Amino acid sequence: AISFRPTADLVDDIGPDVRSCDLQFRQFGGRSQFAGPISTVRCFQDNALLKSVLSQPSAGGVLVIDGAGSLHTALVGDVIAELARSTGWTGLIVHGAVRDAAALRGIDIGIKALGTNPRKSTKTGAGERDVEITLGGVTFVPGDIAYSDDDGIIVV
Amino acid sequence: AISFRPTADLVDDIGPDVRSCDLQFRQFGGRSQFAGPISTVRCFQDNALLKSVLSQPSAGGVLVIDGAGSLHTALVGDVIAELARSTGWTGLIVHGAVRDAAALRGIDIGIKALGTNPRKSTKTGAGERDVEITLGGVTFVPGDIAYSDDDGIIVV
Amino acid sequence: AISFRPTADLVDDIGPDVRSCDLQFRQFGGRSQFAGPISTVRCFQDNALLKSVLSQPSAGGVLVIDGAGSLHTALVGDVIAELARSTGWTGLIVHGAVRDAAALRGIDIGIKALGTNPRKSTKTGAGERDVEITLGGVTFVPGDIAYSDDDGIIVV
Per-residue DSSP letters for chain B?
Answer: -PPP--HHHHHHHH-TT-EE-----EE-SSBS-EEEEEEEEE-SSB-HHHHHHHTS--SS-EEEEE-TT--SSEEE-HHHHHHHHHHT--EEEEEEEES-HHHHTTSSSEEEEEEE--SBPB-S--SEES--EEETTEEE-TTSEEEE-SS-EEE-
- Note whether A149 contacts C102, CB cutoff 8 Å: yes
CA distance B64 to B145: 11
In this structure, the number of other CB atoms found within 10 A of the CB of residue B64 comes to 28
Say if residue C144 carries a ligand binding annotation: no
Vertex C115 angle, CA C43 and B154, to 5°: 145
* Residue A152 DSSP SS3: coil
The closest alpha carbon to B34, from B12, B64, B60, B8, belongs to B60
Pairing of strands B145-148, B153-155: antiparallel
Q: Which chains touch B (3 or more CB pairs under 8 A)?
A: A, C
Helices (H), C88-141: 101-104
Q: Do C115 and A24 touch (CB under 8 A)?
A: yes
User: What are the two backbone dihedrals, phi and then psi, of residue A114, each rounded to the nearest 5 degrees?
Assistant: -85, -20
CB C73 within 8 A of CB C50: no
B147 contacts in chain A (CB < 8 Å): none
Q: In whole angstroms, give the CA distance from residue C135 to residue C114.
A: 12
CATH number at residue C96: 3.50.30.40
C25-44 burial by CB neighbour count: b if 16+ within 10 A, else e? Answer: bebbbbbebbbbbbbbbbbb
Q: How far is it, in rounded angstroms, from Cα B90 to Cα B5?
A: 14
Whether the CA torsion C119, C123, C124, C125 is positive or negative: it is positive
Q: Are C147 and C153 in contact (CB under 8 A)?
A: yes
A4: amino acid identity, one letter: F
- The whole-angstrom separation of Cα C20 and Cα C11 is 8
Report the residue of A151, A154, A155 to disrupt the C interface, i.e. the one with the largest count of C CBs within 10 Å. A151
Residues in chain A within 8 Å Cβ distance of C117: 20, 22, 151-152
Q: Of C77, C102, C118, which is closest to A152 when you measure between CB atoms?
A: C118
Are A115 and A71 contacting, i.e. CB atoms less than 8 angstroms apart?
yes
Name the 3-class secondary structure at C98. Answer: strand
Residues facing residue A41 across a β-bridge? A65, A129
Q: Which residues, listed in sequence order, are joined to residue C76 by a DSSP beta bridge?
A: C98
Inter-chain CB proximity C22 and B71 less than 8 Å: yes
Neighbours of chain C (3+ CB pairs under 8 A): A, B
Rounded Cα distance between B31 and B29, Å, is 5
* B147: phi then psi, degrees, rounded to nearest 5: -125, 130
Report the chain C residue with the minimal C-alpha distance to residue A152: C117
Kindly state the helix (H) or strand (E) to which residue C92 belongs, with its residue range: strand C91-98
Contact C116 A12 (CB under 8 A): no
Q: Does B3 touch chain A (CB under 8 A)?
A: no
Sign of the torsion angle spanned by Cα atoms C26, C27, C32, C35: negative
Split into its structural domains, chain A has a count of: 1
Residue B59's Cβ-count burial label (10 Å; 0-12, 13-18, 19+) is: exposed
* Burial class of residue A72 (count of CB atoms within 10 Å of its CB; 0-12, 13-18, 19+): middle
Strand-pair category, C145-148 with C34-42: antiparallel
The one-letter code for the residue type at B124 is: T
Of B11, B16, B24, nearest to A71 by CB-CB distance is: B24
- Write out chain C residues lying below 8 Å of A24, CB-based: 71, 115-116
- Beta carbons of C132 and C112 less than 8 angstroms apart: no
Number of H helices, E strands in chain C: 4, 12
Q: Is B77 annotated as a binding residue?
A: yes
Question: CB distance A151–C115 less than 8 Å?
Answer: no
Task: Tell whether C137 is within 8 A of chain A (Cβ).
Answer: no
Q: Are strands A138-140 and A133-135 parallel, antiparallel or unpaired?
A: antiparallel
d(CA A8, CA A18): 10
Q: Give contacts of C 4-63 with B, CB under 8 A.
A: 6-8, 10-12, 16, 18, 20, 22, 24, 32
Instruction: Tell me the nearest-neighbour CA distance from C48 into chain B, angstroms.
Output: 32
B95-111 burial, b at 16+ Cβ within 10 Å, e below that, comes to bbbbbbbbbbeebebbb
Q: What does the alpha-carbon distance between residue C23 and residue C14 come to, in Å, rounded to a whole number?
A: 20
Question: Beta strands of chain A (E only): which ranges?
Answer: 19-20, 26-27, 34-42, 62-66, 74-76, 91-98, 110-116, 128-129, 133-135, 138-140, 145-148, 153-155
Do the annotations mark residue C99 as ligand-binding? yes
Q: Which residue range(s) make up the domain with B122? A: 1-156
Residues of A in contact with C116 (CB under 8 A): 24, 150-152
Question: B100, C7: Cβ pair inside 8 Å?
Answer: no
Cα atoms found within 13 Å of the Cα of residue A76, Cβ hemisphere only: 38
Q: Are residues A28 and A117 in contact, defined by beta-carbon separation less than 8 angstroms?
A: no
CA distance between the termini of chain B: 15
